[PDB]
Amino acid sequence: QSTFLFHDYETFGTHPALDRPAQFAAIRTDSEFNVIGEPEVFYCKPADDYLPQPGAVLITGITPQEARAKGENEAAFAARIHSLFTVPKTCILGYNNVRFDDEVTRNIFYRNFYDPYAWSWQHDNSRWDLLDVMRACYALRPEGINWPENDDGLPSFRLEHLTKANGIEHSNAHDAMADVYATIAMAKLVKTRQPRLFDYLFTHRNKHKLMALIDVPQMKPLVHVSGMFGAWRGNTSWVAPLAWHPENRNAVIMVDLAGDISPLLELDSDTLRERLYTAKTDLGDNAAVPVKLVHINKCPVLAQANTLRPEDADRLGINRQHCLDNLKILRENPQVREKVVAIFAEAPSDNVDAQLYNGFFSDADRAAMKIVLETEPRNLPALDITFVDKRIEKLLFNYRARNFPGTLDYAEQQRWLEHRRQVFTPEFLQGYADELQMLVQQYADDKEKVALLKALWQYAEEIV
DNA sequence: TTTTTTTTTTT
């Protein structure tokens, strides 16, 4: 039988490729989300070349020390996660996971000699994200479920706010599992209150399932939901697919039909290209370019035209007319599509860890890495295999120097400290201080928080 | 199998 898999991370920072993980959580589930298997949780040892960015530690409450003690080396952290995720017929998911938690999962596998995509592709493996489903469910069919309004009075879509607003427990928040359960809790709330909707979002999660909606030459008007539209509009507005992104066929070029199209008609690409790369403030007394890219491969909420009903669009405030007129004009303008699609025809990182998306690895290397996966820590020095990619030869030096310091050789050991020297440069460390200071000054009142700010400096000493 | 500015989200 096919299964879901609700997972969650706790990291030492936002950026997946640079900031490292700290904790993991996961639960296997059936077609109706009921709890199969043993709840799995590990910790990840932070290597001797990285300092957690305070903000992460303050909100997680998880110090590196704790992780160094409780946790396994990143290789095992990967392996153990890879082994859960490689299970066939699985829909691996979480909250914001596609935007975040999964990326980490990629960079981990990338770092530790694995396929960072296969886990959500090979042997009938898919993925999903409830965050969009919440926004959608509020936007279109909010019957039954509660949604919390903020200070100003706009709907929140935090897990911590949605849980407390739906009876689900979230004492001990930002605790790997506590989320993973409270994450499942919502799926059963959406399959209950609007399975009508749920199955729609679900079945159309896959790439090939989305093309059904996207009619490009004729520009069929679809309903879309992203946080990018913002809470003020209920994260919703109709869109018309102009074209497939020139340099990235995983992206479709859409038009916000709720906005003011005229710029598209009354400017050239090189201005529009400036006007959409213009920020929300310095676009002064003008209109904003109502264009956006929807990425098909990222479980986007795409629905059929009439899905959004007059009962809903009135509740929200989106102006049916404007979107139609604008469509009429867009279909009556076969050159809007000309420049807009030109815009996206203008095309680099230095650190190997962030060098994930430099294409893919050739079948020659795919083997060569899988063979490095066979080699026991002993023989990594010994084995002679040729590599096409320059990224691997680098990755292998780090891989050993973090996960297996015992394997290091007299020279390597001193190259590693010379790396650590280039990493931990005086002023760079000073920053860390200024930050810790400023924060402890900010969070001076609290003792339990400061307790961490202390520990991070303690860590920042001994590690250096 | 893959990636500048919206907006909100997770750590």
Short mmCIF file of C-alpha atoms (C1' of nucleotides) in Angstrom, two decimals:
data_model
loop_
_atom_site.label_atom_id
_atom_site.label_comp_id
_atom_site.label_asym_id
_atom_site.label_seq_id
_atom_site.Cartn_x
_atom_site.Cartn_y
_atom_site.Cartn_z
CA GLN A 1 0.00 0.00 0.00
CA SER A 2 1.13 3.57 -0.76
CA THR A 3 1.89 5.89 2.17
CA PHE A 4 2.43 9.48 3.27
CA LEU A 5 5.37 10.62 5.40
CA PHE A 6 5.08 13.76 7.53
CA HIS A 7 8.54 15.14 8.33
CA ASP A 8 10.14 18.22 9.90
CA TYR A 9 13.58 19.69 10.64
CA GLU A 10 15.09 21.94 13.26
CA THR A 11 18.20 23.66 11.82
CA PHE A 12 20.85 26.14 12.97
CA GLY A 13 19.72 28.75 10.42
CA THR A 14 17.54 29.59 7.43
CA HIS A 15 19.86 29.00 4.45
CA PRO A 16 19.84 25.21 3.70
CA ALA A 17 23.14 25.03 1.79
CA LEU A 18 25.16 26.94 4.41
CA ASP A 19 23.33 26.65 7.74
CA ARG A 20 23.23 23.03 8.91
CA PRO A 21 20.53 20.81 10.44
CA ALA A 22 20.18 19.97 14.13
CA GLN A 23 17.12 17.74 14.55
CA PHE A 24 14.83 15.58 12.41
CA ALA A 25 11.33 14.13 12.87
CA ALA A 26 9.15 11.75 10.82
CA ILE A 27 5.99 9.59 10.93
CA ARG A 28 4.78 7.08 8.31
CA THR A 29 1.01 7.15 7.62
CA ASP A 30 -1.74 5.46 5.57
CA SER A 31 -4.32 6.74 3.05
CA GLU A 32 -6.34 8.28 5.93
CA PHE A 33 -3.24 9.63 7.74
CA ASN A 34 -3.30 7.15 10.65
CA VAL A 35 -0.07 6.50 12.50
CA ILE A 36 1.91 3.53 11.15
CA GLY A 37 5.39 2.64 12.43
CA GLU A 38 7.76 3.97 15.09
CA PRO A 39 8.12 7.77 15.37
CA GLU A 40 11.71 8.53 14.23
CA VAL A 41 13.87 11.36 15.67
CA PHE A 42 17.64 11.96 15.60
CA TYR A 43 20.05 14.84 16.19
CA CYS A 44 22.85 16.05 13.90
CA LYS A 45 26.41 16.83 15.03
CA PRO A 46 27.53 20.28 13.84
CA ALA A 47 31.02 19.93 12.35
CA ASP A 48 34.09 21.85 13.58
CA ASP A 49 33.74 24.61 10.93
CA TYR A 50 30.33 26.19 11.61
CA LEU A 51 28.60 28.44 14.14
CA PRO A 52 24.78 28.48 14.45
CA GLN A 53 23.22 31.86 13.64
CA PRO A 54 21.81 32.98 17.05
CA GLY A 55 18.23 33.50 15.84
CA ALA A 56 17.92 29.80 15.05
CA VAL A 57 19.23 28.76 18.47
CA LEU A 58 17.01 31.28 20.29
CA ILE A 59 13.84 29.95 18.63
CA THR A 60 14.78 26.24 18.54
CA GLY A 61 16.22 26.25 22.06
CA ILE A 62 18.64 23.68 20.63
CA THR A 63 22.31 24.46 21.28
CA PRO A 64 25.08 22.91 19.17
CA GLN A 65 26.57 21.23 22.26
CA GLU A 66 23.28 19.40 22.87
CA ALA A 67 23.26 18.31 19.23
CA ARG A 68 26.94 17.33 19.38
CA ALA A 69 26.15 15.14 22.38
CA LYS A 70 22.77 13.65 21.42
CA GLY A 71 23.37 13.58 17.67
CA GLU A 72 25.01 11.48 14.98
CA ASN A 73 27.51 12.72 12.39
CA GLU A 74 25.86 14.26 9.32
CA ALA A 75 26.59 11.15 7.20
CA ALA A 76 24.43 9.00 9.49
CA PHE A 77 21.91 11.84 9.75
CA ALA A 78 21.64 11.64 5.97
CA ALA A 79 21.75 7.85 5.65
CA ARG A 80 19.03 7.40 8.30
CA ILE A 81 16.83 10.03 6.59
CA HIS A 82 17.64 8.69 3.11
CA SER A 83 16.51 5.22 4.22
CA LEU A 84 13.05 6.50 5.25
CA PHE A 85 12.64 8.64 2.15
CA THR A 86 13.79 5.94 -0.33
CA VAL A 87 10.75 3.77 0.59
CA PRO A 88 8.64 3.22 -2.59
CA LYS A 89 5.05 4.50 -3.04
CA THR A 90 5.53 7.47 -0.68
CA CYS A 91 4.20 11.03 -0.58
CA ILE A 92 6.85 12.71 1.59
CA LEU A 93 5.50 15.97 3.04
CA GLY A 94 5.42 18.66 5.74
CA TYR A 95 4.71 22.35 6.39
CA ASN A 96 6.42 24.80 4.00
CA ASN A 97 8.65 21.78 3.35
CA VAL A 98 8.91 22.35 -0.41
CA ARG A 99 9.90 25.96 0.15
CA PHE A 100 12.27 24.97 3.00
CA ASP A 101 12.46 21.60 4.80
CA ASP A 102 12.99 19.68 1.57
CA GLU A 103 15.75 21.97 0.26
CA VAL A 104 17.73 21.11 3.40
CA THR A 105 17.02 17.43 2.64
CA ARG A 106 18.53 18.04 -0.80
CA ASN A 107 21.65 19.84 0.40
CA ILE A 108 22.22 17.07 2.97
CA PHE A 109 22.09 14.35 0.30
CA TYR A 110 24.14 16.51 -2.05
CA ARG A 111 26.75 17.01 0.68
CA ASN A 112 26.76 13.32 1.67
CA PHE A 113 27.03 11.65 -1.77
CA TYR A 114 23.38 10.85 -2.56
CA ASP A 115 20.80 11.75 -5.21
CA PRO A 116 19.06 14.86 -3.79
CA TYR A 117 15.97 14.39 -6.02
CA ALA A 118 15.48 10.61 -6.51
CA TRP A 119 14.05 10.35 -2.98
CA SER A 120 10.96 12.22 -4.25
CA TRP A 121 10.86 10.59 -7.71
CA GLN A 122 12.14 6.97 -7.97
CA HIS A 123 9.74 4.08 -7.20
CA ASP A 124 6.47 6.09 -7.26
CA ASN A 125 7.64 8.76 -4.80
CA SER A 126 5.95 12.18 -4.72
CA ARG A 127 5.77 15.14 -2.30
CA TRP A 128 3.34 17.77 -0.99
CA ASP A 129 2.93 20.83 1.25
CA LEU A 130 0.03 21.71 3.56
CA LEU A 131 0.88 25.42 3.93
CA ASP A 132 -0.53 26.17 0.47
CA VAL A 133 -3.48 23.88 1.25
CA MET A 134 -4.34 26.00 4.31
CA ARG A 135 -4.23 29.22 2.27
CA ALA A 136 -6.31 27.57 -0.47
CA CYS A 137 -8.82 26.14 2.03
CA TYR A 138 -9.23 29.58 3.62
CA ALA A 139 -9.42 31.27 0.23
CA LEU A 140 -11.98 29.03 -1.44
CA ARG A 141 -13.71 26.77 1.11
CA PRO A 142 -13.27 27.98 4.73
CA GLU A 143 -16.40 26.13 5.93
CA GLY A 144 -15.81 24.48 9.33
CA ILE A 145 -12.16 25.37 9.98
CA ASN A 146 -10.98 28.29 12.16
CA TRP A 147 -8.40 30.86 11.01
CA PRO A 148 -6.70 33.34 13.37
CA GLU A 149 -6.68 37.08 12.59
CA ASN A 150 -3.64 39.22 13.48
CA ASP A 151 -3.26 42.59 15.25
CA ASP A 152 -4.40 44.41 12.09
CA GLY A 153 -7.02 41.70 11.45
CA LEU A 154 -5.52 39.61 8.62
CA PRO A 155 -5.52 35.79 8.50
CA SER A 156 -2.38 34.01 9.73
CA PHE A 157 -1.11 30.70 8.33
CA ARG A 158 1.55 29.83 10.92
CA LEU A 159 1.46 26.29 12.30
CA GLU A 160 1.85 27.79 15.79
CA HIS A 161 -1.18 30.05 15.17
CA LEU A 162 -3.30 27.47 13.31
CA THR A 163 -2.76 24.81 16.00
CA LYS A 164 -3.66 27.06 18.95
CA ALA A 165 -6.64 28.27 16.87
CA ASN A 166 -7.94 24.70 16.25
CA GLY A 167 -7.54 23.04 19.67
CA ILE A 168 -4.40 21.13 18.62
CA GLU A 169 -1.69 21.20 21.29
CA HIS A 170 1.45 23.23 20.68
CA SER A 171 3.03 23.57 24.11
CA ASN A 172 6.72 22.94 23.44
CA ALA A 173 6.52 24.62 20.02
CA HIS A 174 9.34 24.33 17.46
CA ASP A 175 10.08 20.83 18.78
CA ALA A 176 10.70 18.50 15.81
CA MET A 177 7.89 16.01 16.54
CA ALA A 178 5.40 18.35 18.27
CA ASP A 179 5.16 19.99 14.86
CA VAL A 180 5.09 16.72 12.87
CA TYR A 181 2.02 15.62 14.84
CA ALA A 182 0.38 19.06 14.72
CA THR A 183 1.27 19.00 11.01
CA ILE A 184 -0.69 15.76 10.52
CA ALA A 185 -3.52 17.17 12.65
CA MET A 186 -4.39 19.65 9.88
CA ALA A 187 -4.41 17.10 7.02
CA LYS A 188 -7.15 15.17 8.85
CA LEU A 189 -8.93 18.52 9.37
CA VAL A 190 -8.85 19.30 5.61
CA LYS A 191 -9.71 15.77 4.45
CA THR A 192 -12.67 16.07 6.88
CA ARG A 193 -13.98 19.59 6.31
CA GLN A 194 -13.44 19.76 2.52
CA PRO A 195 -12.15 16.52 0.91
CA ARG A 196 -13.89 17.87 -2.19
CA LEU A 197 -11.10 20.45 -2.16
CA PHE A 198 -8.39 18.22 -0.67
CA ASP A 199 -8.49 15.62 -3.45
CA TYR A 200 -8.38 18.40 -6.06
CA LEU A 201 -5.19 19.89 -4.59
CA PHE A 202 -3.83 16.40 -4.02
CA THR A 203 -4.38 14.80 -7.44
CA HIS A 204 -3.03 17.95 -9.16
CA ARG A 205 0.19 17.96 -7.06
CA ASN A 206 2.28 16.35 -9.82
CA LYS A 207 3.96 18.21 -12.71
CA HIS A 208 2.04 16.30 -15.42
CA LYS A 209 -1.21 16.78 -13.46
CA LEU A 210 -0.84 20.59 -13.66
CA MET A 211 -0.51 20.97 -17.46
CA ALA A 212 -4.19 19.94 -17.57
CA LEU A 213 -5.02 23.41 -16.23
CA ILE A 214 -2.36 25.41 -18.11
CA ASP A 215 -3.70 26.33 -21.57
CA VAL A 216 -1.00 28.68 -22.88
CA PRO A 217 -1.74 29.72 -26.48
CA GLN A 218 -5.38 30.46 -25.60
CA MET A 219 -4.42 31.51 -22.04
CA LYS A 220 -7.08 29.74 -19.96
CA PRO A 221 -7.92 31.71 -16.78
CA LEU A 222 -6.90 29.70 -13.70
CA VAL A 223 -7.35 30.28 -9.98
CA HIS A 224 -4.08 30.49 -8.04
CA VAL A 225 -3.08 30.67 -4.39
CA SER A 226 0.35 31.69 -3.14
CA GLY A 227 1.56 33.63 -0.11
CA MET A 228 3.21 35.90 -2.68
CA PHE A 229 -0.19 37.51 -3.41
CA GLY A 230 -0.40 38.35 0.31
CA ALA A 231 -2.90 38.08 3.16
CA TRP A 232 -4.79 41.28 2.24
CA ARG A 233 -6.13 39.47 -0.87
CA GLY A 234 -6.52 36.12 0.94
CA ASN A 235 -3.47 34.83 -0.97
CA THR A 236 -5.62 34.55 -4.12
CA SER A 237 -6.23 35.90 -7.65
CA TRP A 238 -6.93 34.59 -11.17
CA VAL A 239 -4.04 34.13 -13.62
CA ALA A 240 -3.49 33.67 -17.35
CA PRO A 241 -0.46 31.67 -18.54
CA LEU A 242 1.40 33.72 -21.15
CA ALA A 243 4.32 31.37 -21.74
CA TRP A 244 6.81 28.84 -20.41
CA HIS A 245 9.86 30.55 -18.92
CA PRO A 246 12.54 30.71 -21.69
CA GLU A 247 15.47 29.32 -19.64
CA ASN A 248 13.46 27.09 -17.23
CA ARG A 249 10.55 24.96 -18.44
CA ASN A 250 9.70 24.17 -14.79
CA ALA A 251 8.36 27.76 -14.60
CA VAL A 252 5.25 29.19 -16.30
CA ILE A 253 4.92 32.95 -16.85
CA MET A 254 1.57 34.07 -15.43
CA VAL A 255 -0.37 37.33 -15.27
CA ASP A 256 -2.05 38.66 -12.14
CA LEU A 257 -5.46 39.54 -13.54
CA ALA A 258 -6.49 41.31 -10.30
CA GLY A 259 -3.81 44.00 -10.84
CA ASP A 260 -3.31 46.84 -13.34
CA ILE A 261 -2.08 45.43 -16.67
CA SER A 262 -1.51 48.77 -18.45
CA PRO A 263 2.28 48.87 -17.71
CA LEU A 264 2.64 45.73 -19.87
CA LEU A 265 1.04 47.63 -22.78
CA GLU A 266 2.67 50.99 -22.08
CA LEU A 267 6.31 49.94 -21.43
CA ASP A 268 9.12 47.97 -23.09
CA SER A 269 10.75 44.88 -21.55
CA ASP A 270 13.89 46.78 -20.50
CA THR A 271 11.64 49.08 -18.45
CA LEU A 272 9.28 46.32 -17.33
CA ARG A 273 12.39 44.27 -16.51
CA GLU A 274 13.40 47.18 -14.26
CA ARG A 275 9.84 47.70 -12.98
CA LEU A 276 9.44 44.11 -11.75
CA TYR A 277 12.97 44.02 -10.29
CA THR A 278 12.01 47.31 -8.59
CA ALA A 279 11.16 46.87 -4.89
CA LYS A 280 7.79 47.51 -3.19
CA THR A 281 8.90 50.95 -1.90
CA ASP A 282 10.97 52.51 -4.72
CA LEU A 283 8.17 51.75 -7.20
CA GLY A 284 6.82 55.16 -6.17
CA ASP A 285 3.60 56.76 -7.44
CA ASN A 286 3.35 54.11 -10.19
CA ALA A 287 1.62 50.79 -10.86
CA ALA A 288 3.39 47.49 -10.14
CA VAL A 289 3.97 44.98 -12.94
CA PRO A 290 1.31 42.29 -12.29
CA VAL A 291 3.36 39.32 -13.55
CA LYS A 292 4.61 36.27 -11.64
CA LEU A 293 6.32 32.92 -12.21
CA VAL A 294 4.54 29.79 -11.02
CA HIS A 295 6.89 26.83 -10.69
CA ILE A 296 5.08 23.65 -11.76
CA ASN A 297 7.46 21.37 -9.83
CA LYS A 298 6.63 22.93 -6.42
CA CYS A 299 3.07 21.82 -5.60
CA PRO A 300 1.44 25.16 -6.50
CA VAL A 301 -2.29 25.70 -5.92
CA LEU A 302 -3.61 25.84 -9.49
CA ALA A 303 -7.37 25.43 -9.99
CA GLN A 304 -10.00 25.69 -12.74
CA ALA A 305 -11.50 29.13 -13.53
CA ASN A 306 -14.89 28.86 -11.79
CA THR A 307 -13.43 27.17 -8.68
CA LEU A 308 -13.37 30.65 -7.13
CA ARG A 309 -17.05 31.47 -6.60
CA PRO A 310 -18.90 34.83 -6.38
CA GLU A 311 -19.68 33.98 -2.73
CA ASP A 312 -15.90 33.78 -2.16
CA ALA A 313 -14.58 36.56 -4.42
CA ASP A 314 -17.08 38.90 -2.70
CA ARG A 315 -15.89 37.73 0.73
CA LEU A 316 -12.29 38.43 -0.34
CA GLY A 317 -12.65 41.52 -2.55
CA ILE A 318 -11.15 40.46 -5.91
CA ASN A 319 -12.87 42.25 -8.82
CA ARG A 320 -14.21 39.65 -11.28
CA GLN A 321 -14.70 42.35 -13.92
CA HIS A 322 -11.14 43.69 -13.93
CA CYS A 323 -9.71 40.17 -14.36
CA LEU A 324 -12.07 39.53 -17.28
CA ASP A 325 -11.51 42.87 -19.03
CA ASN A 326 -7.76 42.44 -18.59
CA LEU A 327 -8.07 38.93 -20.06
CA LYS A 328 -10.07 40.25 -23.03
CA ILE A 329 -7.38 42.87 -23.60
CA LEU A 330 -4.59 40.28 -23.18
CA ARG A 331 -6.16 37.96 -25.75
CA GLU A 332 -6.64 41.12 -27.83
CA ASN A 333 -2.88 41.81 -27.45
CA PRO A 334 -0.61 39.20 -29.18
CA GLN A 335 2.47 41.34 -28.31
CA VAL A 336 2.10 41.56 -24.51
CA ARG A 337 3.21 37.93 -24.66
CA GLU A 338 6.12 39.04 -26.91
CA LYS A 339 7.99 41.39 -24.54
CA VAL A 340 6.99 39.76 -21.24
CA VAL A 341 8.60 36.51 -22.40
CA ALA A 342 11.64 38.44 -23.65
CA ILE A 343 12.13 39.93 -20.16
CA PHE A 344 13.17 36.50 -18.85
CA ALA A 345 15.99 35.99 -21.39
CA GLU A 346 18.96 37.41 -19.42
CA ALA A 347 21.15 34.93 -17.50
CA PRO A 348 27.29 32.16 -9.91
CA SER A 349 28.44 30.92 -6.48
CA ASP A 350 31.96 30.31 -5.13
CA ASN A 351 31.41 27.81 -2.26
CA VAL A 352 30.97 24.10 -3.13
CA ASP A 353 28.23 23.57 -0.51
CA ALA A 354 26.04 26.08 -2.38
CA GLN A 355 27.10 24.63 -5.76
CA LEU A 356 24.08 22.29 -5.81
CA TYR A 357 22.25 23.59 -8.88
CA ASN A 358 25.15 23.48 -11.34
CA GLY A 359 23.18 21.16 -13.62
CA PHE A 360 23.21 17.48 -12.67
CA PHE A 361 25.73 14.64 -12.28
CA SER A 362 26.45 12.50 -15.36
CA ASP A 363 25.90 8.71 -15.31
CA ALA A 364 29.69 8.33 -15.13
CA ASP A 365 29.71 10.25 -11.83
CA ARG A 366 26.41 8.77 -10.57
CA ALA A 367 28.29 5.47 -10.41
CA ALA A 368 31.52 7.01 -9.07
CA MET A 369 29.63 8.46 -6.08
CA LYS A 370 27.59 5.30 -5.49
CA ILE A 371 30.98 3.55 -5.36
CA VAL A 372 32.17 6.10 -2.76
CA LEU A 373 29.04 5.10 -0.82
CA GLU A 374 30.29 1.47 -0.86
CA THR A 375 33.77 2.36 0.43
CA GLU A 376 34.20 1.97 4.20
CA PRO A 377 35.85 4.93 6.03
CA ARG A 378 39.13 2.95 6.06
CA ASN A 379 39.52 2.73 2.29
CA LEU A 380 38.47 6.27 1.27
CA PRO A 381 42.17 7.24 1.16
CA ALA A 382 42.95 4.00 -0.71
CA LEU A 383 40.34 3.82 -3.49
CA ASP A 384 41.18 5.22 -6.95
CA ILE A 385 38.14 6.35 -8.96
CA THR A 386 38.04 9.11 -11.61
CA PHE A 387 35.54 11.99 -11.43
CA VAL A 388 34.19 14.15 -14.27
CA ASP A 389 32.77 16.88 -12.03
CA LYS A 390 34.98 19.36 -10.14
CA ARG A 391 32.32 19.59 -7.39
CA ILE A 392 32.77 15.96 -6.25
CA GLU A 393 36.56 16.08 -5.82
CA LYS A 394 35.92 19.05 -3.51
CA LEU A 395 32.89 17.52 -1.74
CA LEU A 396 34.94 14.44 -0.87
CA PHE A 397 37.58 16.50 0.97
CA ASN A 398 34.91 18.15 3.13
CA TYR A 399 32.84 14.98 3.55
CA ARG A 400 35.80 13.25 5.23
CA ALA A 401 37.03 16.28 7.21
CA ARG A 402 33.63 16.74 8.87
CA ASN A 403 32.09 13.26 9.17
CA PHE A 404 35.30 11.21 9.57
CA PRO A 405 38.15 13.33 11.07
CA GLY A 406 39.82 10.00 11.96
CA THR A 407 40.43 9.38 8.23
CA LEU A 408 42.44 12.62 7.73
CA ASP A 409 46.12 12.62 6.66
CA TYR A 410 48.99 14.80 7.98
CA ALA A 411 48.73 17.22 5.03
CA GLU A 412 44.92 17.21 4.78
CA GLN A 413 44.64 17.93 8.51
CA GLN A 414 46.65 21.13 8.01
CA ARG A 415 44.68 22.07 4.88
CA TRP A 416 41.51 21.72 6.97
CA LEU A 417 42.78 24.05 9.70
CA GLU A 418 43.85 26.48 6.95
CA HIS A 419 40.28 26.23 5.66
CA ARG A 420 38.94 26.81 9.18
CA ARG A 421 41.34 29.77 9.33
CA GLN A 422 39.78 31.29 6.17
CA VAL A 423 36.36 30.53 7.64
CA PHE A 424 36.97 31.88 11.15
CA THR A 425 38.58 35.20 10.22
CA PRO A 426 38.83 37.80 13.05
CA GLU A 427 36.18 40.33 11.94
CA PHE A 428 33.84 37.51 10.83
CA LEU A 429 34.01 36.31 14.42
CA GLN A 430 33.61 39.91 15.66
CA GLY A 431 30.28 40.07 13.83
CA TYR A 432 29.18 36.99 15.80
CA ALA A 433 30.06 38.89 18.96
CA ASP A 434 28.30 42.14 17.95
CA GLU A 435 25.23 40.05 17.12
CA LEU A 436 25.29 38.06 20.39
CA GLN A 437 25.81 41.29 22.33
CA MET A 438 23.05 43.19 20.52
CA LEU A 439 20.69 40.24 21.04
CA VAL A 440 21.52 39.72 24.74
CA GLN A 441 20.98 43.49 25.08
CA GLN A 442 17.67 43.01 23.27
CA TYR A 443 16.83 39.80 25.17
CA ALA A 444 18.35 41.03 28.45
CA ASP A 445 15.20 40.47 30.57
CA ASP A 446 14.78 36.75 29.90
CA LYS A 447 17.13 34.31 31.67
CA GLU A 448 16.18 31.11 29.82
CA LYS A 449 16.89 32.74 26.43
CA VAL A 450 20.15 34.36 27.62
CA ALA A 451 21.12 30.88 28.88
CA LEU A 452 21.47 29.99 25.18
CA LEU A 453 23.23 33.21 24.08
CA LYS A 454 25.79 32.35 26.72
CA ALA A 455 26.14 28.74 25.56
CA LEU A 456 26.67 29.86 21.95
CA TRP A 457 29.64 32.00 22.99
CA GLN A 458 30.99 29.12 25.11
CA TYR A 459 30.64 26.99 21.97
CA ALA A 460 32.15 29.77 19.84
CA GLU A 461 35.27 29.65 22.01
CA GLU A 462 35.95 25.90 22.32
CA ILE A 463 35.27 25.24 18.62
CA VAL A 464 37.69 27.99 17.53
"C1'" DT B 1 15.72 15.85 -11.41
"C1'" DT B 2 17.44 22.10 -11.87
"C1'" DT B 3 17.74 27.48 -10.03
"C1'" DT B 4 16.84 39.50 -9.47
"C1'" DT B 5 11.09 40.90 -7.39
"C1'" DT B 6 6.89 40.49 -5.22
"C1'" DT B 7 4.74 37.69 0.14
"C1'" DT B 8 4.80 34.88 3.90
"C1'" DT B 9 6.85 31.04 5.87
"C1'" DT B 10 10.18 27.95 8.37
"C1'" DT B 11 14.87 28.05 11.62
#
